[PDB]
Amino acid sequence: DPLVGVFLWGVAHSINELSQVPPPVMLLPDDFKASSKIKVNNHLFHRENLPSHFKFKEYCPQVFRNLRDRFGIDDQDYLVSLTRNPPSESERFLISYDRTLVIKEVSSEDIADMHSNLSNYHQYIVKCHGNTLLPQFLGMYRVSVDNEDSYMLVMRNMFSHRLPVHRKYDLKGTLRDMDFLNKNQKVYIGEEEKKIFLEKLKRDVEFLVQLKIMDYSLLLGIHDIEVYFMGLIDILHPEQYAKRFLDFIT
Amino acid sequence: DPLVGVFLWGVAHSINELSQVPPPVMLLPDDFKASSKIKVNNHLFHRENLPSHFKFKEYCPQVFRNLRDRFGIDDQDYLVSLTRNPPSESEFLISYDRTLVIKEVSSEDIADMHSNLSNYHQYIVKCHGNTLLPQFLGMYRVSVDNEDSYMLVMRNMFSHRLPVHRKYDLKGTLRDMDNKNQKVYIKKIFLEKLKRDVEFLVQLKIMDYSLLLGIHDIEVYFMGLIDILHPEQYAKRFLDFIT
């Protein structure tokens, strides 16, 4: 597949030309308008993998990089754990070979709103220090292949790269939260450790609030031996259905 | 330095891009009509070193890929010496190693070169890439600021160590007219090359072409056919004159 092969190509090129770039301490406006696009034209050259003609572009190269740092994520690893190897197809979900990250295909508009919520996003990243149940966003690119566009999003996988999920629902208010009734879900893992979680949950959704962020769901998984994996997923009146959520997951 | 500095970006990019494409078993004719261009444009990204609106064109990657390995120059070697350190200019831009030369040439200068590659390369295979001709190690065109500029990299006919004290420009900066009683003593070998090289250089009907002379005071003499860009006529003036 070109596109996925173009993707990586781009991930590497940029991340290595980015490295050659000193990180600013303070994100200026222009950095949120900043971009990086390459066009690759080959007549009778390469073609062993990536199309003779393609395009690539990373959005806010410094903005999402700065988030990577905020996400305690080194770029060398981010690359090696991205390019060293091919990913697997899922569902346009794509688990890294490391199974540490999640590549999802997105829409032309989704990116924009991303670019819109963007300036707000990092504000929260810094303040709460990138630990929320929210999806950690590190990668946002666009892969054109023979006049074909496709934007992808790269984030940390909520599930474990190692411990396999045997149970997994999408809590709202792969069976959805409508079949979680009769089974009698377990609202107990520990008062203390649960508090911290419940803490995040409330603030994270107070944040979604301020953006007018439409209907969102929560992904909870389990790895029985039982381990759990949980965080909001579908983050792309609200106040009315909102008090349904935190309460529903309660 | 905008274009020059844009030059190395592509050079590296290429050398670092070529490194992944498996070298073929036989170079095909269409290869001689191949090219690989890169159009880079970022909005509000960097400025500190490289322009925001540059482009890069590497001409016939494989062939020069081959004409390099054939001239005994590892792409890394070729790479590091051409880019690792800012190049110095001369009367071109002699690399920082004093190993490589990067001359500029007009778009027309190039047009000939695309002819020159076909025969020039097959020749080079035959003679095992060791003539008294220039070693075309690469050909590129870095267009910076809507201004195309054609660069062509070759091996410094001189040595990065032994410095010249005297250079002659023998046809048929002292030229061939300049009595100081040259030194012709040390030969059949170097004559092996000049005899066939021109033989080939004439095959393409090629007009006037000089011979470079080098000298070093510590006998060190660096010479070879340079200006490779009627055939029999002034040909027999040269070999004979340089005899």
SS3 of chain B: the string is: CHHHHHHHHHHHHHHHHHCCCCCCCCCCHHHHHCEEEEEEECCCCCCCCCCCCEEEEEECHHHHHHHHHCCCCCHHHHHHHHHCCCCCCCCCCCCCCCCEEEEECCHHHHHHHHHHHHHHHHHHHHCCCCCCCCCEEEEEECCECCCCCEEEEEECCCCCCCCCCCCCEECCCCECCCCCCCCCCCCHHHHHHHHHHHHHHHHCCCCCCCEECCCECCCECCCEECCCCCHHHHHHHHHHHCC
* Cβ neighbours for A99, distance < 8 A, ≥ 6 positions apart: A157, A160, A161, A162
| Cβ pair B51, B2 in contact under 8 A | yes
Contacts of A38 in chain B (CB under 8 A): 38-40
With both helix axes pointing from N to C terminus, report the angle between B188-203 and B107-126 in degrees, rounded to the nearest 10: 130
Contacts of A43 in chain B (CB under 8 A): 33-36
* Cβ neighbours for A165, distance < 8 A, ≥ 6 positions apart: A159, A221, A222, A223, A229
Tokens 């474990």 belong to residue: A160
CA distances from A182 to A167, A175, B159 (A): 15, 13, 85
Q: Which of A104, A113, A200, A234 is catalytic?
A: A104
| Cβ pair A221, A167 in contact under 8 A | yes
| Cβ pair B102, B108 in contact under 8 A | no
Of A39, A48, A61, the CB nearest to B45: A61
* The pair of three-digit structure tokens given for residue B78, joined into one six-digit string: 């070729």
Give how far A119 is from chain B: nearest CA, Å: 17
Helix (H) or strand (E) holding A210: helix A191-211
- Residue B224, strand partner residues: B212
> Which one-letter DSSP state was computed for residue A90?
-
CA distances from A150 to A7, A99, A147, A157, B140 (A): 10, 22, 10, 21, 32
* The pair of three-digit structure tokens given for residue B130, joined into one six-digit string: 């060791």
| Cβ pair A219, A201 in contact under 8 A | no
* The pair of three-digit structure tokens given for residue B152, joined into one six-digit string: 């062509």
CA dist B199 and B96 (Å) reads 34
The domain over range A1-157 is classified in CATH as 3.30.800.10:
yes
Within 10 A of A38 (CB to CB), how many other CB atoms are there? 20
Burial class (CB in 10 A: 0-12, 13-18, 19+), B239: middle
Q: How was this structure determined?
A: X-ray
- Residue B109, strand partner residues: none
| Cβ pair B151, B101 in contact under 8 A | no
CA dist A57 and A36 (Å) reads 5
Largest CA distance in chain A: 65
B34 to A44: CB separation less than 8 angstroms, yes or no: yes
- Residue A145, strand partner residues: A54
Of B21, B34, B45, the CB nearest to A48: B21
- Residue B39, strand partner residues: A39, B55
CA dist B57 and B11 (Å) reads 10
Chain A residue whose CA is closest to B47 = A21
CA dist A87 and A248 (Å) reads 35
| Cβ pair A138, A68 in contact under 8 A | yes
| Cβ pair A63, A29 in contact under 8 A | no
* Cβ neighbours for A178, distance < 8 A, ≥ 6 positions apart: none
> What residue type is assigned to position B155 of the chain?
R
Q: Count of CB contacts below 8 A, A vs B?
A: 55
Give how far A101 is from chain B: nearest CA, Å: 26
Residues of B labelled catalytic:
103, 208
Its CATH class, for the domain covering B1-156, is alpha beta
B43 to A34: CB separation less than 8 angstroms, yes or no: yes
3 state DSSP class of A58: strand
